[PDB]
From Swiss-Prot, chain A:
The protein's name: F-actin-capping protein subunit alpha-1
Tissue expression notes: Present in all tissues examined.
Main location: cytoplasm
One GO MF term attached to the UniProt entry: actin filament binding
Lineage: Eukaryota, Metazoa, Chordata, Craniata, Vertebrata
UniProtKB/Swiss-Prot annotation, chain B:
GO MF annotation, one: actin filament binding
Gene label: CAPZB
Entry-annotated residues carrying N-acetylserine: 1
Known function: F-actin-capping proteins bind in a Ca(2+)-independent manner to the fast growing ends of actin filaments (barbed end) thereby blocking the exchange of subunits at these ends. Unlike other capping proteins (such as gelsolin and severin), these proteins do not sever actin filaments. May play a role in the regulation of cell morphology and cytoskeletal organization.
Tissues of expression: Isoform 1 is detected in pectoral muscle, cardiac muscle and gizzard. Isoform 2 is detected in brain and liver (at protein level). Isoform 2 is the predominant isoform of nonmuscle tissues and isoform 1 is the predominant isoform of muscle tissues.
Sections of the chain in a coiled coil: none
Name of the protein this chain belongs to: F-actin-capping protein subunit beta isoforms 1 and 2
Organism, scientific name: Gallus gallus (Chicken)
Record-stated family: Belongs to the F-actin-capping protein beta subunit family.
UniProt-listed GO biological process terms: actin polymerization or depolymerization; barbed-end actin filament capping; cell morphogenesis; cytoskeleton organization; lamellipodium assembly; negative regulation of filopodium assembly; regulation of cell morphogenesis; regulation of lamellipodium assembly
Pfam families assigned: F_actin_cap_B
Gene Ontology CC, one term: F-actin capping protein complex
Lineage start: Eukaryota, Metazoa, Chordata, Craniata, Vertebrata
Keywords: Acetylation, Actin capping, Actin-binding, Cytoplasm, Cytoskeleton
Amino acid sequence: RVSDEEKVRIAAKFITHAPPGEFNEVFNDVRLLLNNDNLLREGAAHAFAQYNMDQFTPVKIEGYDDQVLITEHGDLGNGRFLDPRNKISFKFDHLRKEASDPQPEDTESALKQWRDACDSALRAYVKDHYPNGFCTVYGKSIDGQQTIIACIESHQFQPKNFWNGRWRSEWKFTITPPTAQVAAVLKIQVHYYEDGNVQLVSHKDIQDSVQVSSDVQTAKEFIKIIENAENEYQTAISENYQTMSDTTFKALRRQLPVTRTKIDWNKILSYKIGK
Amino acid sequence: SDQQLDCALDLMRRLPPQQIEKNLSDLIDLVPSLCEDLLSSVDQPLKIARDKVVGKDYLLCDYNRDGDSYRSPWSNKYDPPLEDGAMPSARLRKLEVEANNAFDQYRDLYFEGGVSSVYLWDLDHGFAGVILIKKAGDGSKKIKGCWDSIHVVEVQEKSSGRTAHYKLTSTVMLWLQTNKTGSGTMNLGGSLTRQMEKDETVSDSSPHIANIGRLVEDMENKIRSTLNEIYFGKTKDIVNGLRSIDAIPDNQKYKQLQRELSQVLTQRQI
């Protein structure tokens, strides 16, 4: 018998896997399917948090002009997140759209030097390539090693026309002078659902070895790595679209029969070699 | 629980179609009483089975299933073996054989390969059937593709007339995938559904199969066009709206304008 614990985990998986801009619909579906609000509240908060986090949910703090990215890296752990740019503390309410009642966050200021350079250096990259994009660079110490984590998010939601899309890119820069190592993952998800369910799910994992110089210098070196890698990724995607449409798709079903005219069903229902 | 089924269908219309199998199973775990209703209303990637006695593949769906076994359209036998599995009447079975043969030709003419399967069943004042077609592309190419056709037709026979009412609900599932260096893993898949109803004359020159065939053909030709548009047209455009390779000539106007319109509500609200 499927225990209530198993049903809760199932409900949680569905909820955290909602496509971009459709969280509520999926949540309401699961809620009515689970049909047990007591069980639903067991993992709700955790579900909401995980979703917004892996979705790089762009949020606007009470009044900073702050579009900041909700990610794990910014998860304080107490129910609050970090805004490395404006550098405050903000409590994110998961149900409601807003996240308010901030707290100043005087920093460690150790890796911040790099952090602050990359951040607004990337902030330029984003404004140049993402129509409705936002970025958040994290300066942090990961078990001794210093790392810069730049997160980029971009989306377009048009539910009235039955479609939504979102871009997510995460670059981990681990410094080990003279030359450092790079690790990233690019992600794209598109959903079209008017009388159907079509989705583009794609992601690319990349690892690079980069030479580390100055502060404003290594930064521009990075924004360059990213720019080239993401342009290459996007390029490979438009190409794939081209082949799928002019080669793969046509190899599946013809537009017209080999006979080159619509089918003569009376002929199919009788016409024989002999018996 | 009808809202539940409705909610179950809405959910499958949103979760990644790439995992329909795992998700449908979980969905059933969550609501075991809806198992039968979901297995019949939720379209899933078509599975191939081998008819050993005839040496021919056939497709699996809820409509040729009885318990944990499926009926082959070739040998009219269940696999795994069953004792008293549901079978169409001898007279419907004959029409079923003929429908399979007609659609085999239809499949070869439009898909030049792949597999097809037709299963029929009697209704109170008519009959119904499902036409299944699966076609997978060149397994040697960088990009993999698969087309799944799922046509369910209901035929309402008229007492007087030999004119019948046909209701066709069709779904084409199109799956495209590639594992190339430059793109990593790219999966473009899912399906589109269309429905059609028509009153039609039934005669010796235009029997049931011909009418169903014409409807299926028109339906698939229309869905093929829509698929091309949505998959390679619309999702691509959404993708180009998320990012642009060329620097987007920054626009101050829109931001300046938005500032103006926003303060109107802010300096208007409280």
